[PDB]
């Protein structure tokens, strides 16, 4: 039970659970393409999690054989927003995977987000944010660490993924290997937009140093500190 | 005599020694504003060194009062290109100064470079290029770290500036703090622009591995591998 759904409106549903996997019918997206998925907690075990945004059933990576999801209303997903609503940080020790259409994938959770061994299958672009989505009227226009002071961590078993990552929060503290087709770092309180372009920094009251102890598998590393120790 | 000018039309000539510190007269900048000066031998101390693109007398940070440079018959250059000619490496163990009109600064060697607590005043860009320049009828078409496999080395002490820093090399082994405004470091087997826009990569027949094992004190930086340890 590392995934619990919120159950308001835009908590997803538990499809399955195939050898330990748990199988997320994410909600219905939005006419911006973005199925906003609200969570109480957000943990992935080594099984994984499947995310399914698929329109006609077939074979997962992580889960075996799955149907559609009649949640999309015959249109997948562009972006799946998963957040965490409550104060429970996030422990990922496996592969998250979009079942069906690709799309890009965001977990946000201002408590804190730790990665060991953690991956993404079928995504465009991956992120992990240690801060808050910002919706205006319904629209998602970035995301926020302004006022906040907690961790990303990347341990010893780090992260891969074959598409895009961006790794956005107060601080970042990695000792593991990460992979992917390019690395982005935004470190320190901003605003940014739905793309992660900074809008705004601003200097926290006490330093937030970062550290990037293992290495990184990329043929394109951006590291960026508004307010990094390798 | 750390720097020793090459004798042909491209060498600089040194004009004082203040203190330790050698004052190189840069030669007369190109129609491109390239001020192309060749050494024998490019290696800096303690005490520093400076290069003088002056048009007026006055003070220098690091050689106390300097006079203008007759080389540059009226015209500061924009960019001063210091390439090695022979098989020796360079070592930099103190401050590249720019007397006079700031320029960007780029030192070339392909035999390798090491930085040991060196830096650069008063320059908008510098950049150590473990490469050579690419000059196309008298015209700088860019740098090229092709068939290279020889070092970039950043010693305990560092490397400081105030301005923008480039470290272009087939490998990095940096082991002390990177102070810049941005860092950008490229790897591999390359060709670049005269922006460092990367034009070609190749793969080397082994492993150009690349390690930052210091820290970054800068706002934004910039690894690519085309071929990282942190």
Chains 1, 2 share one sequence.
Do not use: W
Request: include cysteine; aromatic fraction near 6%; glycine fraction near 12%.
């Amino acid at each position: 039970n590392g995934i619990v759904p919120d159950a308001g409106h835009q908590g997803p549903d538990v499809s399955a659970v195939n050898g330990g996997t748990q199988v997320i019918n994410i909600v219905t997206p939005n006419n911006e393409g973005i199925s906003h998925n609200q969570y109480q907690d957000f943990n992935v075990g080594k099984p994984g999690a499947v995310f399914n945004n698929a329109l006609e059933a077939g074979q997962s990576q992580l889960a075996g054989h799955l149907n559609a999801n009649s949640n999309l209303n015959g249109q997948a997903a562009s972006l799946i927003l998963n957040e965490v609503v409550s104060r429970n940080p996030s422990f990922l020790l496996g592969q998250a995977e979009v079942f069906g259409i690709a799309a890009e994938y965001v977990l946000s959770n201002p408590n804190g987000i730790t990665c060991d061994g953690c991956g993404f299958i079928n995504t465009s672009r991956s992120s992990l944010v240690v801060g808050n989505p910002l919706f205006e009227n319904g629209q998602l226009k970035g995301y926020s660490t302004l006022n906040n002071t907690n961790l990303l961590s990347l341990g010893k078993n780090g992260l891969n993924t074959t598409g895009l990552l961006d790794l956005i929060a107060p601080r970042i503290d990695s000792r593991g290997k990460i992979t992917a087709a390019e690395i982005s770092a935004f470190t320190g309180q901003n605003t940014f937009s739905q793309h992660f372009d900074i809008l705004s920094s601003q200097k926290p009251v006490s330093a937030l140093d970062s550290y990037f102890f293992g290495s990184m598998q990329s043929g394109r590393i951006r590291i960026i500190n508004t307010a990094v120790k390798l």
